[PDB]
Design an enzyme around this catalytic site. Structure first.
Site, short mmCIF file in Angstrom:
data_model
loop_
_atom_site.label_atom_id
_atom_site.label_comp_id
_atom_site.label_asym_id
_atom_site.label_seq_id
_atom_site.Cartn_x
_atom_site.Cartn_y
_atom_site.Cartn_z
NE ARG A 46 -3.08 0.35 3.07
CZ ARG A 46 -2.58 0.67 4.28
NH1 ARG A 46 -2.14 1.89 4.62
NH2 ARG A 46 -2.43 -0.31 5.19
CE1 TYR B 185 -15.85 9.33 -17.69
CE2 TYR B 185 -14.59 9.21 -15.69
CZ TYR B 185 -15.39 8.59 -16.59
OH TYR B 185 -15.75 7.28 -16.45
CG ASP C 206 -7.76 14.06 -16.52
OD1 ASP C 206 -7.06 13.46 -17.34
OD2 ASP C 206 -8.88 13.58 -16.16
CE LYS D 38 -10.75 5.59 -19.68
NZ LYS D 38 -10.86 7.09 -19.51
#
Ligand SMILES: Cc1ncc(COP(=O)(O)O)c(C=O)c1O
Ligand SMILES: Cc1ncc(COP(=O)(O)O)c(C=O)c1O
Ligand SMILES: Cc1ncc(COP(=O)(O)O)c(C=O)c1O
Ligand SMILES: Cc1ncc(COP(=O)(O)O)c(C=O)c1O
Lengths: 393, 393, 393, 393
Positions: free
Chosen positions: B55, B108, B181, B206
């Site tokens: 983590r 988005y 972004d 993507k």
């Protein structure tokens, strides 16, 4: 009778693959093709089943989820890419600025900081209290109280909390959700919903995957609340999307869960008893001890007494470092619940992030040693400890 | 001279493996063994390098991180288990109840919900504006403003936003962070820090992975800030921990990132030109068109014009469904940036989560279709559109 | 004292990873970088250690290899991409046109074909005998005899073969190799070199991986011979190169091998006893029965009696189909040794490739069913057989 | 028109998954469940479709296979766990003791030893001849001749062989199979069946997977012969069973095959021409040179001239070691065909196993250097060579 837990970690939620794969395949795909525009817009609207995109749901991940939901006897389960993501997706879906959260004060170290420092900054109020004292949760409730949270046994002193009495006080006003982190028991040892809990979370990193090679979290509870944790806490707030590959590793690890939990609990009872008898050792914490505080509540809540042990040497912290540096079979590392035995020092390692005061207010001492017993031969385990422990005497 | 992009997506941040493995191995391990207790305490205290727990960091995920940080020219990068997780861990580490956030209204879908709904129940203030219009940013600046956020080109209209202008307005006040972004461009077409941006995020699901089989995010920016995002955003708040297996796959996908972006762009310019000429299409938004509003800005900011195309049919909503239901080569599903060409209907699919008036204010109509071109033969791609479109007429 | 089996399936052949990874990483790399040309030439000439190319060796596959070689007490182990590949690479490196081969007539179907059909078109002579009968081995020995081969217990009848006796007969002539396929026992129940065997092979697709998701083989024996098998059998003749990803998964599966074999055996003895008592069953072959022919030999050679059971219904072929078509918990598929219980019909399925007279000579009738018990609850397993069987009557 | 190769490495052989996964899932399962006994016995008899067990066939592996079969324009393809396994499964299915095989003498080093030393020992006869001379295959045929085998361009001198003239002579008597190893071209550059070849094999390790992390082989040819290679050469003789996981890695690598092959062939033409002009370099072999021997045949057989280059320095072998040890971007290792550029010395590394005499009879010299150009920026590649090459002058 319901499928037994032993049979169900292999066969609950049976999948139907088109080729009859004995082991359902791995859906490593970000995205799903629509047959037509109307079907995709229907799924998007929550009006038609089928998949859309892996942050929103995936067939391999759903297989794990229905298997966990069955073993925890809850309607649904949402899987996430770490135990902290499961904790956080659940409470940041439920809470808003102005709400109040009550938590047990002995928590894993990173849960304590999420509650203490992040929920705090988003206008949420939190109380840390000892939820094991009869009555404390009710004394700290307020109109706005929304969640009561705890871990039992606690990480890492193994304190026992009477879940049913915590629930009875939390549900004494409406609209309160009880959340129990059941990482240290696993669903083979305890089902927290039996006692009134609403939501059960796990670090699947530990026992459920059982093989020290996956970080992942699980949320188990009712369908409509978990549907909101999925569409808000996973989709938008945490983005904690489990890889379908790691979900299929955890289903693979799940299928030996019942045999591993029994073997680790049997080895741990032997080891804890051995440790408790050694002259360099001062104090041993193990829920199966009759003198454990809350033993009798542990016996009602736990089917087996687990594989966690915590102990203190009469040589304190320097003794701890020596034992630990000289062990040969036990592994020095954090985490717990794997096939191999692991050991660590919680104040310099997992609970170091929590300020000393706050540690010790909870019972975390600087001499504690925390052990998670694996499935090695118990006599070799005792022998590694004998050689390390004899060297301090 | 700096290692070029085309070499660096394969060779930046070279690894040193003890056996000389050509492809660095997959660390699919949750935790790391300390040599001794001291090294453990040291690592936890930030005084010694090395690994602890997946983590918190893992060597396969550091390799992908340093390769992306190199390609975006940033001092650091943090990888996450979804693009939402990169955005959330980023803005949830920065903000606290009481701060202010400015964002471009055309985002988005899922980010817009996070920002409109999540942020605001946490006491954050948010305004959605057109950062593409001169003066809007400075006019909404407030004393508590902490972030200015945007995507260019924007998802799904392909609006171009003048980065340099937005940054000089946001940074005319002290203490503001501009966050861009960069998903639709990838580090191969744009490096937003070149323009004054402070924090660059990606949906690596993507183009960077490019193979439609991984969901992951990336955060790129200063060591200081990203160390905070790693210890707070990732560690406690989102728990958006990437699988090492998926990191390794992204690394793998990354190595063709340069030839895939060039081949996707080349294909896209041909497909966009073809759509533009077609009598059933009312409008085509492509950054390479000469007439595309903001084409000079697109030109200063992008090395290539990308593989995203958005277009509107003169028959609106009913003509868009017909065309998308008779396409035989282009694939109907959400997502984008893979080797295969994908298409969808934003209003009913990726942006149906946005109240209709907000979609409409940002130019998302219901006749609009979004296309991500992949690397098939451009003449077979145009021929699919030709048969589908001619069937409309 | 030697590291026990139960510890060693987790800790034998410990790895040293540069980051201290708890679970050694996946070398999913085809080739390895030389530091310089000399080291390259040295490695190729056997003068320097290190890795070259995954067909020739890979660190993840060496880790699994050294862990199995430890558990079978052999000097070395070579892993392959199927049990057939382990057998073939083994016998194709040893033999040459003109040699002679003796085998037990009761074999896995596919090995029998390899030996009856393949070997013999290559000019090898083969005779299939009952190596379980005193004197048959020595009476078929020929001057050119090179291998004596067998499986015990045998697939699918569970015939026991006295290893020690077969080895003293085969080794009464110089230059013979005894090869034992140890699949049905696994290194946890039997170590055939203890008995004079020279080469031990496994289908690691069965109990050693134990999770039904990997097809792989292992070869265990002297460094000398296995270096030849690696450079000739594997490198040129079979090309049976294991995937590092599948090796790593077997390693993973291997760590529960001890608790799975004990739990499978315990379950099997209960299920075998239940089948034996049932009026629809004519015969049950199980190695733990007191009356099982060769039970004293099974007892000297096996630490546990295994999870294989084979039984014959008094209704023959038509009753076997009915029972196998109405089983709800036991799974109908070929293979064996997984966590889930599997069953099949040898004559029409794994051994249908063997001309019927040869099956019949080895005791494979058409009323015979083969069962591999897994780790479900033994009372649910017996209840599945009870409903299926009672429906026959 | 047939789907173009460019579109087909992504879309040929489209799969239909039940959830419409954009990327078909991974069938990591050893075994398949029967719906009933009659269906399993029917599949076993070759009378009913569906899966049985992964050594015999697997849906993810079949997806790769139909995609390769389409790109090679052959009826079927069988995938194996290494190029050597594909070579060996094909010829050990076809041949028996007493048959005769003719092969080109310049072969990869491990194919040469399989033919020279193993087929030899199983009573098969082999001739090694230069199949590029017009007429040599016919002069060496005998009644018993069964296979004629070659590689073009050859590994590693890049010798060109006129396939159609080799076929015309081999099919001048009945029953002869022509086998061409097309590893160095890939199906984007050549389809050997165009010229009369019957069977086409590959090391999928190289270009087809393209990412240096999978060892695998492919067999392409008619359905009935490949059905016998599957049921005899894979099932029984080699056991070379590809892991379904690595098959799904090679389909993922396949989808950028056409863009990688063009980019590596364009970079290689630039690099070979640069090398040919440098004063330390003596001789450069590249099929695109007009002075290459067999250029004109290479142009008819090859669509692009590939990314392999072989060259000799005027400083011979010591010069070779120096260049190689000083390169910085090019990688020292064996294998070839990845995204990154690799380089090696064939007489001390890949062809060391073949005796010097036999090397040099084929044209393998001690100064040759063999380079496989990746997709890095061509100018940086030339620059790494300039700096290494200037140091020798
Ligand atoms: C009780 C418990 N909860 C949660 C976690 C955090 O889970 P993870 O490390 O997967 O994020 C841990 C550590 C744990 O011990
Ligand atoms: C521009 C933008 N960024 C963020 C997201 C979210 O990424 P993910 O889907 O990986 O959570 C996507 C989709 C995207 O298109
Ligand atoms: C006893 C025996 N060994 C060999 C084999 C072949 O192993 P694989 O199926 O892994 O090729 C099997 C099945 C087996 O049962
Ligand atoms: C022409 C060619 N064939 C076959 C191979 C062997 O394939 P692999 O290394 O996958 O077994 C190689 C090396 C190769 O260069």
């Amino acid at each position: 009778e319901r499928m037994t837990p032993a049979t169900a970690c292999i066969h609950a939620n049976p999948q139907k693959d088109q080729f009859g794969a004995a082991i359902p395949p791995i859906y490593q795909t970000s995205t799903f093709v629509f047959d037509n525009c109307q079907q995709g817009g229907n799924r998007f609207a929550g009006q038609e089943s089928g998949y859309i995109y892996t942050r929103l749901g995936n067939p391999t991940v759903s297989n794990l989820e229905g298997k966990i939901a069955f073993l925890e006897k809850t309607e649904a389960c949402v899987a996430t890419s770490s135990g902290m993501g499961a904790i956080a997706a659940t409470v940041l879906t439920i809470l808003k600025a102005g709400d109040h959260l009550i938590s047990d004060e002995c928590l894993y170290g990173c849960t304590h900081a999420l509650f203490e420092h992040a929920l705090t900054k988003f206008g949420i109020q939190v109380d840390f209290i000892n939820t094991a004292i009869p009555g404390e949760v009710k004394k700290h409730m307020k109109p706005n109280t929304k969640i009561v949270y705890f871990e039992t046994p606690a990480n890492p002193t193994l304190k026992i909390i009477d879940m049913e009495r915590v629930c009875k006080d939390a549900h004494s006003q409406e609209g309160v959700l009880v959340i129990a982190d059941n990482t240290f028991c696993s669903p083979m040892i305890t089902n927290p919903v039996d006692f009134g809990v609403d939501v059960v979370v796990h670090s699947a990193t530990k026992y459920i995957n059982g093989h020290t090679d996956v970080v992942a979290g699980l949320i188990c509870g009712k369908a409509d609340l978990l549907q909101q944790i999925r569409m808000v806490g996973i989709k938008d707030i945490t983005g904690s999307v489990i890889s379908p590959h790691d979900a299929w590793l955890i289903t693979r690890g799940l299928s030996t869960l019942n045999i591993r939990m029994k073997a680790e609990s049997e080895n741990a009872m032997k080891v804890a008893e051995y440790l408790k008898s050694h002259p360099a050792v001062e104090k041993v914490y193990y829920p199966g001890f009759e003198d454990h505080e809350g033993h009798d509540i542990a016996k009602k809540q736990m089917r087996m007494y687990g594989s966690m042990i915590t102990f203190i040497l009469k040589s304190g912290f320097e003794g701890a470092k020596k034992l630990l540096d000289n062990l040969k079979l036990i592994t020095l590392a954090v985490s717990l619940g794997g096939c191999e035995s692991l050991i660590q020092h919680p104040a310099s390692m997992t609970h170091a992030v929590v300020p000393k005061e706050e540690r010790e207010a909870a019972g975390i001492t600087d001499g504690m040693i925390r052990l998670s017993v694996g499935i090695e031969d118990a006599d070799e385990l005792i022998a590694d400890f004998k050689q390390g422990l004899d060297a301090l005497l």
